[PDB]
Chain A
């Protein structure tokens, strides 16, 4: 029963770590998306630098 509790605890650790990796994937994706707004804002600013009237 102690050995069985240890294996059930290892199963529960694996389930917990799998859910943790899922949450960390979801969060990494949110950051990647906001980072692509930052990248696109850099691109938009680079286009604005070619508008010599507004850029002046």
Chain B
């Protein structure tokens, strides 16, 4: 029947979307260590300015 064919195609697209979402979000989780550096350098700069003010 065309109904089950069309339903299975939507169900296949749904399974693909969540499987691709898992891969995207797993790759995004690996970026956390690279994105962390933007805050780390600001904490260095904050302590450096405070240190100069103490000198």
Contacts and interface: CB of A to CB of B under 8 A. Distances in A.
Interface of A: 3-4, 7-8
Secondary structure of the A contact surface, majority rule: helix
Interface of B: 51, 54-55
B47 to A, nearest CB: 9
Contacts, number: 7
A40 B54 CA distance: 52
Contacts of B51: 3-4, 7
A3 B44 CA distance: 13
Contacts of A3: 51
The 7 closest A-B pairs by CB, nearest first: A7-B55, A7-B54, A3-B51, A4-B54, A4-B51, A7-B51, A8-B54
